[PDB]
Amino acid sequence: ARPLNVALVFSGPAYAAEAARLGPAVAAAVRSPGLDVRPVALVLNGSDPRSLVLQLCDLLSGLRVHGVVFEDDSRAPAVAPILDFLSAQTSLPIVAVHGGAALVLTPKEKGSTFLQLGSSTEQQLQVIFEVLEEYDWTSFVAVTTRAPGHRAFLSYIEVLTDGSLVGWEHRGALTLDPGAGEAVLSAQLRSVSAQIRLLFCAREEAEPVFRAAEEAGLTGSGYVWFMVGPQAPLPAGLFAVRSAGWRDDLARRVAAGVAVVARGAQALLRDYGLGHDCRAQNRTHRGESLHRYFMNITWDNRDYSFNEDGFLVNPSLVVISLTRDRTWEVVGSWEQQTLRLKYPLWSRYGRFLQPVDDTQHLTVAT
Amino acid sequence: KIVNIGAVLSTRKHEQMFREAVNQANKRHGSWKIQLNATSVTHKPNAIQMALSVCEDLISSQVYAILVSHPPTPNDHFTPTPVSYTAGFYRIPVLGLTTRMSIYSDKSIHLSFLRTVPPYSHQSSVWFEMMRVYSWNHIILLVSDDHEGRAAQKRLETLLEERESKAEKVLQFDPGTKNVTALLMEAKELEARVIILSASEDDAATVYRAAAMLNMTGSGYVWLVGEREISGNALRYAPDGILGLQLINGKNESAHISDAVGVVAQAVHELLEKENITDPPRGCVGNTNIWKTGPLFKRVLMSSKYADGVTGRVEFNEDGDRKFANYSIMNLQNRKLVQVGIYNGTHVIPNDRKIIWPGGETEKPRGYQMSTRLKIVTIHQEPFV
Helix, strand or coil: CECCEEEEEEECHHHHHHHCHHHHHHHHHHHCEEEECCCCEEECCCCCCCCCHHHHHHHHHHCCCCCCCCCCCCCCCCCCHHHHHHHHHHCCEEEECCCCCCCCCCCCCCCCCCCCCCHHHHHCCCHHHHHHCCCCEEEEEEEEECCCCCHHHHHHHHHHHCCCCCCEEEEEEECCCCCCCCCCCHHHCCCCCEEEEEEECCCCCCHHHHHHHHHHHHCCCEEEECCCCCCCCCCCCEEEEEEEEHHCCCHHHHHHHHHHHHCEEEEEEHHCCCCCCCCCCCCCCCCHHHHHHHCEECCEEEEEEECCCCCCCCCCEEEECCCCCCCCCCCEEEEECCEEEECCCCCCCCCCCCCCCCCCCCCCCC | CEEEEEEEECCCCHHHHHHHHHHHHHHHCCCCCCEEECCCCCCCCCCCCCCHHHHHHHHHHEEEEECCCCCCCCCCCHHHHHHHCCCCCHCCEEEEEECCCCCCCCCCCCCEECCCCCCCCHHHHHHHHHHHHHHCCEEEEEECCCHHHHHHHHHHHHHHHHHCCCCEEECCCCCCCCCCCCHHHHHHHCCCEEEEECCHHHHHHHHHHHHCCCCCCCCCCCCECCCCCCCCHHHHCCCCCCEEEEEEECHHHHHHHHHHHHHHHHHHHHCCCEEEEEECCCCCCCCCCCCCCHHHHHHCCCCCCCCCCCCEECEEEECCECCCCEEEEEECCCCEEEEEEEEECEEEEEECCCEECCCCCCCCCCCCCCCCCCCCCCCCCCCCC
């Protein structure tokens, strides 16, 4: 019956109204032997680089927080790295469920135990080919921008394509500079003729790219866009990949976040019967034993595993479908490293990416 | 328009020359509506309240670019980490005066960062050219299990594929270990006799301790080494005739701060020539958004090409690492160090001084040793075998 005062911090006016409501739900959801669940509700101010360390250590000081779950309703992942630094000195685990874990930050600092609930870049390029394997789409191109991390994007796709019995063919690598000009962007985009394209650009960098495609002619008829990367001018023909908890309940999302920090450490009590060193010195000890401790996590019919840096090693997730009425439809599922589709199809049929060549297709009887 | 040039330095006296450098900027140029001011803050010997000082003082003073400095500790990742986080994620460029460690070149973290000194990973760039000219077609790598070591190992291998070479065999250590004698047996049977090290003082301690024990420092052995362990605690049992490397102005804060001021002195004139020139945020709490001019400020920043300062020829480009630096090659004789090699940035320029090889030999050796015995494979075929 070791006490554990888990802390909950939220940013945004939306969670202020429901801060008290999440109390009974989170406390009742998690129940482990010999452990006490005492959630505490807190509200943060702003979502930006700010003097969070002024109050985050202040609340940590004098309280046995043990583990705190980070939540934020912001798309920009500019708060995790600054929160990562304060995690290194305190040697305590912080997990982000929504917003905070927008992107995988690797490699991390020495001794960091900060973990995320998200999808790695490589893991987003392995389900994109799995569904593509059973739906032909042999022809594809790669389009990259000036956004950082583009080097890994080209390297990752090349490794998977080579050494395969299918024998994928590549139509070169396309590089575009949004800051150069509209004439340059359109000419390069239309240089290669293909209805299937791969794009990599920042969330705010996408809009200049879509404008070039509108005047390049690669928006109408049937064209495919794979919105893989960080995150009115939205022509149809876009696809992407996200996590399974794309539309999970707010109460259950926090429950999943609080489960790993609390239940994962219950195995330590099986061995024998902590990290409150902020505003204190002369102690560094070790901070790497935590990673191997937090390996066995399984809930809500899902498998959760983390590596040394920390992200979804077994990312049970789903693939979003084509967006037509500004809605995030989902059509593909991936569990136990096995592909599964709800709309099986052969070649190109009605209402599902009809062929781009009406005068170059034949139906042959034999 | 008030223009503030922030910086974080060590020691009160060093900050005094910062005022002198910024003072000359106003007079050296014909700027009329631009005024430069210097902000001085000392290093806080703890990371928790380190972020409080930069937020409350430097950020609130709307500085234009920040200069960092080496911490008083001999080797710690303490000073440059917090400074590149708070202001770094406001898209405020940070200038690295003494930043040399190879982690801060990823752009996944530390989105905005500029270095006035080439990092340690770039040492492998001149190793290959010196290796190629002096024959040396067979080598062995001894790199420890560190992220910095991986970058150095990758650079050597990523350029050696032109000549179709796999760099023979590569051994990986565990940092902090004290006895690696047993694993050195795999470094004895190979034909090559050229050993390349890239590690820290602690790692190189055990390597140089057992090197003389296993008769590895005698004739016919040549050691190529990293700059960290040439000077330091590893000098106790360093083998003679070591062909090392060093960088000029490696600990000259006064020279580097002058060059950093000169680069931005012309840059600030270029910024006040375009449209939508939104000022960097005022205060640390009031603004909660990324300010308008992002890569445009950096794009002109990594475009300077002039000839000023002692080092001269600054061409900050790509990830933000200096190109064609001035390197030196030295030798160890009777526990005394003398420099014999001079690098001008394009090719190695030797000297008339004798380059005595390890073990007290003069003739130039090669990384090759014939294998006297041969193991032979055969199969059962009736007429032949």
